């Protein structure tokens, strides 16, 4: 609720990893970032293998635990966390100044980062984070 984001990024139809990589770089530069429409973010590849990977992450675990997110919400945030030294003070500070959102709770329309957009007209092998979460068993709350 209420997040003074210096930058509001729109993930719709963008390559999750390429966005995450930039959002990481920016948060480590002191910027407060908000990623919007996470459910509509995308990752290239064969849906079948992609889903197997994430499903494997859900099944992995033990008493010590391996909490892997199912909602497009967390998937994206965990993706960003992997590009930050989240256990160091600086890393945790940056990570905590980044938040991902399902849809867009803001008035402004986020901006599209360079080189992160995927052209649906020249690409058929890709998947929506939202679709991934549905496969994982998430509750489509979007």
């Amino acid at each position: 609720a209420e997040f003074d984001a210096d930058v509001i990024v729109d993930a719709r139809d963008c390559i999750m990893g390429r966005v995450a990589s930039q959002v990481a770089e920016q948060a480590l530069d002191g910027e407060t970032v908000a990623v919007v429409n996470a459910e509509r973010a995308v990752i290239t590849g064969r849906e079948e293998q992609i889903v197997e990977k994430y499903e494997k992450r859900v099944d992995i675990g033990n008493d010590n635990g391996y909490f892997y997110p199912k909602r497009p919400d967390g998937i994206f945030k965990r993706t960003i966390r992997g590009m930050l030294p989240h256990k160091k003070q600086r890393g945790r500070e940056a990570f905590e100044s980044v938040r991902v959102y399902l849809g867009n709770p803001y008035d402004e329309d986020g901006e599209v980062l360079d080189g992160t957009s995927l052209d649906r007209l020249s690409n058929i092998k890709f998947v929506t984070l939202g679709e991934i979460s549905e496969t994982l068993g998430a509750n489509k709350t979007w």
Binding site: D63, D73, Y101, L102, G103, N139, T141, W142
Partner: protein, 337 residues
């Protein structure tokens, strides 16, 4: 060779820890089929007796014949829906929106709640109707409580409070149905929700047994033969293999046993009456005498005598309802002797 064998006890009711609320909390509700109506009720366990019934089963080679059936007597006096809570759908699931309360309160509801002295029912109702206009309204439930004071055999006067969902025709129709019940005084009874012969799910916190060993808690064997005399009688062989070099939470160990919440499915309601017809001579042991609104549940119910138990229309019934079964005899024979 080492023969195979199922593990000891289920891994689906854990962790096996002490329940947070002695008052059960359903985590599921029936589907919105029929007319609007509260989807649950509560009562206090009293004891057991048996009753002779006429075989009601259309597929039984015995249909129509006498039949002895165990029953647990539960005192089910009227409860009171003291408010209507509204939920709104959000990207993070459902969240309470607002509540519509009344002014008529049971003399001792203040033993549990800080009873409202100033509330704006209409504003609440407005906010809810707006929500519904916008289409963000999530299910509708009623804040309910019991009147232990109406049950002499039960020491408490402090009422037990729980939220029960309201499932009905349209959202608008049942929203109205909710408000109607609340506004009055919320006073409702077992009759209004259940009919003898229907299947209900009964939830409740089981009888506590404090700390118990693996044998009792998980069903592991006792040491056998010569092993039973060496110094070990009720201890498992080992806490696991060399590797992984850690004890897995799946190995049966000592701990709290009992006093857990359980939702026992498909319990048939044999009868719903009022009076002392079901009471036993000498009185129900460790309970007392029954003489008021009661419900006869087929079989057993989780929890000890006096504990609060909750009813809910079965969410996954196997059989079709066979209303008002003929009861030819209810035993009142003393439970002592």
């Amino acid at each position: 060779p080492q023969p195979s064998r199922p593990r000891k006890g289920s891994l689906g009711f854990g962790p096996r820890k002490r329940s947070t609320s002695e008052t059960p909390r359903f985590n599921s509700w029936p589907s919105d089929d029929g007319q609007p109506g509260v989807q649950g009720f509560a009562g206090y366990k009293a004891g057991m007796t048996h009753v002779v019934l006429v075989n009601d089963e259309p597929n039984s080679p015995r249909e129509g014949m006498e039949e002895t059936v165990p029953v647990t007597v539960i005192e089910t006096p009227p409860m009171r829906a003291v408010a209507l809570r509204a939920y709104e759908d959000t990207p993070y699931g459902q969240r309470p929106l607002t509540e519509v309360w009344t002014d008529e309160f049971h003399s001792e509801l203040d033993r549990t709640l800080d009873v409202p002295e100033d509330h704006d029912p209409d504003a609440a109702e407005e906010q809810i109707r707006d929500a519904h206009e916008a289409g963000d309204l999530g299910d509708l439930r009623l804040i309910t409580h019991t009147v232990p004071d109406a049950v002499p055999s039960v020491p408490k006067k402090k009422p037990d409070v729980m939220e029960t969902r309201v499932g009905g025709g349209s959202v608008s129709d049942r929203l109205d149905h909710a408000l109607d019940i609340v506004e009055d005084g919320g006073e409702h009874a077992m009759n209004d929700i259940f009919r003898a012969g229907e299947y209900a799910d009964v939830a409740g916190v089981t009888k506590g047994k404090g700390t118990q060993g693996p044998v009792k808690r998980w069903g592991v064997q006792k040491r056998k033969g010569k092993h039973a005399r060496q110094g070990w009688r009720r201890r498992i062989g080992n806490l696991g293999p060399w590797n992984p070099s850690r004890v897995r939470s799946t190995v049966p160990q000592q701990g709290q046993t009992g006093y857990h919440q359980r939702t026992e499915l498909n319990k048939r309601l044999i009868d719903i009456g009022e009076g002392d017809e079901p009471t036993v001579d000498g009185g129900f042991v460790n309970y007392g005498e029954v003489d008021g609104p009661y419900t006869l549940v087929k079989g057993s119910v989780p929890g000890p005598d006096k504990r609060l138990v909750r009813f809910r229309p079965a969410v996954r019934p196997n059989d079709q309802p066979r209303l008002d079964p003929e009861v030819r005899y209810v035993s009142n024979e003393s439970n002592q002797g």
